Write a protein that binds this ligand. Structure first.
Ligand code: NAG
Ligand code: NAG
Ligand code: NAG
Ligand code: NAG
Ligand code: NAG
Ligand code: NAG
Ligand code: NAG
Ligand code: NAG
Ligand code: NAG
Ligand code: NAG
Lengths: 342, 228, 208
């Protein structure tokens, strides 16, 4: 017999004490070695309720990632609170590693294994584990990179699709690579490449899944309505550099309605002056490193917001979302919940 | 204590743009979304959109898509609303609002406990148009044992208001001047009536006096029984 | 999606106001009050949960899709306009205004054909007057050659008279001069509590 509860989880990883890489260094001092032979116990005749939007595991992951970033990605100048802080800002090795979250004694993690689970409600096949799978703390907006894929069908996730203030997470069942590059020899200019054939076919599948949730209305995509660059563009960190990519071409309604078939190339720019995602102010970093900067990632999900208003048309509008990085963790922690044994 | 202070009201012509501000205090500004709701008399309250201070994320109502813009200033904790291409339909009182439930971890946007004091915005043409005054004739036969109704119709004027007196204000008993209605043409119209003894229709003269200050118009109209 | 009923509520202090809202989807429904010249105020949220400062005289209930706000023992600070809300959607509003009670008085109904002066302008306005009645509730229907009219009429009602506590209503039917000359019989039908049956005043175009 158990009950839902919240406790201080501990971290596990496969960090290398010899690595200078930032996540490895953090995990060395913050985490413990992983388990070679994990234990999972499947529970039949047991039905449990889950709610990915009220899962406090997310809150703890959020603190760690903030701590990791704040103690690693140090700016040259920090502008917050109307004051000026000048520090040292050396270039770093940056590439996220998988992180497992685990429960102490008396607590256990319950895991939903329903292949079509949408994040809230009851689950039929529940297993009992001590640790989650290896989750990479990838910080991004609009697109979810390098995450886990949905088992069966594309899954739409929202605390409440009626509430246009609630984020929508689209969980893909087939990843699509995005190939971002800052070539050697403007040093701040970059670009991302995506296979238009793969992407548009997935995007077509996304609209058809949404139709199931919105009474077969016409599904339309639009660019973000406004906000800081971190949300109006696809924002992410590659090799320690802050990238901002324009995703207008990624959501082409014409290609999901001839010629669109090919290689899509998004314009990007590496910024040195960014808004601190600690909800504070502006941080200033050094120019990018010389040579070809490159990262190939899996697009495994999409963050969306749906338009509202007192209207009366048979078409819904969706826009690339983001901003709240806690949603990035929700998308990986959705099948987990902490219970306390007796 | 949560407070929302809005800027002062203003008047605009059709075609102009407007900007209004909402200064927030009493709570952690970046935690909660801010909404804008406008209210016009006779009409359903209309949600315009919300804005989340942290990254300035915004969601605009479909019917306002393209004309509206919401921003914020972090230092002064002030939210801003811009509305462009104004017309008569934008005449209303504009409110900023924030939901009752707000924590660092969670919120509910739509239970609006907190409202600003409101910013009235009028959008109208500077043009004026004087009223047409038509007689509402009593009847044809005189009944020496009853009361007769008469009045004048005051049609197609802009803007408000018009006033009506009778016999230069010497006739007040049984007078009814109705609230004006807004017609499809965009022009106002009202009626003024009065009940009098039918036995005085051949003796007393009844004149309605209509005043429309915006157009500098004063019209007197004698209302008398039709000839047939 | 949100159908608030009715439109205007005319009550005396001490009485109870019953305001209802029919929704098409279930979910957190809120009620707001707007006093004259003041910003709206959250009265009830989540169907029946009373907000801060709100007296237990206010109560929310729900039967099927019908949400109801009842205000017992009306005070001066209760009168105004009330709105229901679900997410970003609002109801049309319910105006709750002060009514001073008196004996029932049937209206006196007059009808005025279009002026000959106005008929030289291409437009025709027919005016129906309901004079000095109580209670305020009244229905007016226009008929043109025994055909129910709709979408071409506007009504106006006076404030309750400070001397005799009655109301007066004006209804105007507007037609083009051409369309007006097409028909003969023009009638307004009046139904009111003080009338044993609906009263119809009418006239025939051309004849005096
Ligand atoms: C739960 O297990 C059943 C029985 O083996 C299996 O058929 C099914 O795939 C599981 N449920 C879901 C929703 O996948
Ligand atoms: C990217 O996806 C492929 C399959 O789609 C997988 O083999 C690979 O491990 C993924 N890379 C990650 C998760 O970093
Ligand atoms: C992914 O899900 C879609 C339905 O949303 C389905 O059409 C498609 O076949 C799936 N792809 C797989 C299982 O590889
Ligand atoms: C998820 O499934 C549950 C089943 O109880 C349902 O109530 C909920 O609306 C679903 N959510 C979405 C986003 O489809
Ligand atoms: C990524 O794009 C670059 C050119 O920008 C290309 O040379 C490279 O082969 C691509 N990488 C992959 C894995 O496709
Ligand atoms: C895009 O992907 C398809 C497979 O889905 C592949 O056959 C094609 O060569 C790719 N196009 C380019 C330009 O790489
Ligand atoms: C994104 O790129 C498109 C390119 O067509 C451009 O129209 C749009 O203004 C850009 N948006 C931002 C926020 O830079
Ligand atoms: C969308 O796709 C079509 C097809 O290639 C192209 O002609 C058009 O210019 C594209 N527009 C945007 C905004 O991506
Ligand atoms: C995703 O993982 C690959 C290696 O699997 C790495 O090269 C890439 O930089 C990662 N992307 C991000 C955005 O961290
Ligand atoms: C959706 O929102 C309503 C209130 O609007 C709430 O009562 C309900 O529990 C929510 N549903 C879920 C699955 O969270």
């Amino acid at each position: 017999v158990w009950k839902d509860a919240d406790t201080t989880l501990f971290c596990a990883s496969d960090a290398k004490a010899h690595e200078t890489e930032v996540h490895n260094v953090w995990a060395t001092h913050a985490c413990v070695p992983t388990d070679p032979n994990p234990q999972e116990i499947h529970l039949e005749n047991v039905t449990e309720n889950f709610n990915m939007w009220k899962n406090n595991m997310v809150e703890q992951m959020q603190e760690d990632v903030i701590s990791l970033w704040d103690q690693s990605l140090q700016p040259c100048v920090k502008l917050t609170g109307g004051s000026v802080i000048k520090q040292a800002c050396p270039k770093i090795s940056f590439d996220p590693i998988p992180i497992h979250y685990c429960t102490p004694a008396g607590y256990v993690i319950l895991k939903c294994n329903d292949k079509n689970f949408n994040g809230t409600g009851p689950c039929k096949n529940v297993s009992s584990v001590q640790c989650t799978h290896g989750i990479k703390p990838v910080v991004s907006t609009q697109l979810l990179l390098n995450g886990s894929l949905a088992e069966e069908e594309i899954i739409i996730r929202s605390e409440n699709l009626t509430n246009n203030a609630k984020t929508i997470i689209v969980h893909l069942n087939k990843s699509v690579e995005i190939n971002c590059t800052r070539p050697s020899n403007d040093i701040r200019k970059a670009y991302c490449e995506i296979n238009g054939t793969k992407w548009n076919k997935v995007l077509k599948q996304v609209t058809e899944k949404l139709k199931e949730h919105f009474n077969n209305k016409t599904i339309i995509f639009q660019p973000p309505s406004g906000g800081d660059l971190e949300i109006t563009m696809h924002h992410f960190n590659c090799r320690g550099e802050f990238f901002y990519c324009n995703t207008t071409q990624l959501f082409n309604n014409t290609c999901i309605g001839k010629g669109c078939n090919g290689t899509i190339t998004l314009p990007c720019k590496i910024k040195q002056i960014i808004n601190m995602w600690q909800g504070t102010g502006q941080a200033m970093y050094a120019p990018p490193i010389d040579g070809k900067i490159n990262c190939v990632s899996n697009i495994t999900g999409i963050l969306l917001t749906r338009d509202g208003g007192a209207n009366n048309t048979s078409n819904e509008t969706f826009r690339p979302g983001g901003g709240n990085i806690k949603d990035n963790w929700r998308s990986e922690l959705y099948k987990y919940k902490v219970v306390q044994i007796e | 204590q949560v407070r929302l202070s809005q800027s002062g009201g203003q008047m605009k012509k059709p075609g102009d743009s407007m900007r209004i501000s909402c200064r927030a205090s009493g709570y952690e500004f970046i935690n909660c979304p801010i909404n804008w709701i406008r209210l016009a008399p006779g009409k359903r309250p209309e949600w315009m959109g919300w804005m989340k201070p942290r990254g300035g994320a915004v969601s605009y109502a479909r019917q306002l898509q393209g004309r509206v813009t919401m921003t914020r200033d972090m230092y002064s904790e002030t939210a801003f609303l811009e509305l462009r291409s104004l017309t008569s339909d934008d005449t209303a009182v504009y409110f900023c609002t924030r939901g009752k439930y707000c924590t660092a971890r969670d919120y509910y946007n739509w239970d609006f406990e907190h409202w600003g004091q409101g910013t009235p915005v009028t959008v109208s043409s500077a043009s004026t148009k004087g009223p047409s005054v038509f007689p509402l004739a009593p009847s044809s036969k005189s009944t020496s044992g009853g009361t007769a109704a008469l009045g004048c119709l005051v049609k197609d004027y802009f803007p408000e208001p018009v006033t009506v007196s009778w016999n230069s204000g010497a006739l007040t008993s049984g007078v009814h001047t109705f609230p004006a209605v807004l017609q499809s043409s965009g022009l106002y119209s009202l009626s003024s009536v009065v009940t009098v003894p039918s036995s005085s229709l051949g003796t007393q003269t009844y004149i309605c006096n209509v005043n429309h200050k915006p157009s500098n118009t004063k019209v007197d109209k004698k209302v008398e029984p039709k000839s047939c | 999606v949100l159908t608030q009923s009715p439109g205007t509520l005319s009550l005396s202090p001490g009485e109870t106001a019953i305001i209802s809202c029919r929704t098409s989807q279930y979910g957190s429904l809120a009620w707001y009050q707007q006093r004259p010249g003041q910003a709206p105020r959250l009265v009830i949220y989540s169907g029946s949960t009373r907000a801060a400062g709100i007296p237990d005289r206010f109560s929310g209930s729900r039967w099927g899709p019908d949400y109801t706000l009842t205000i017992s023992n009306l005070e001066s600070g209760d009168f105004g306009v009330y709105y229901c809300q679900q997410y970003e959607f609002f109801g049309q509003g319910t105006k709750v205004q002060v009514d001073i009670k008196r004996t029932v008085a049937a209206p006196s109904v007059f009808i005025f054909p279009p002026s000959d002066e106005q008929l030289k302008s291409g437009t025709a306005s027919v005016v129906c007057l309901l004079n000095n009645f109580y209670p305020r509730e009244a229905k007016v229907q226009w008929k043109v050659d025994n055909a129910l009219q709709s979408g071409n009429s506007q009504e106006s009602v006076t404030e309750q008279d400070s001397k005799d506590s009655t109301y007066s209503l004006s209804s105007t039917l507007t037609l083009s001069k051409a369309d007006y000359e097409k028909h003969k019989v023009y009638a307004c039908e009046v139904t009111h509590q003080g009338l044993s049956s609906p009263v119809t005043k009418s006239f025939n175009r051309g004849e005096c």
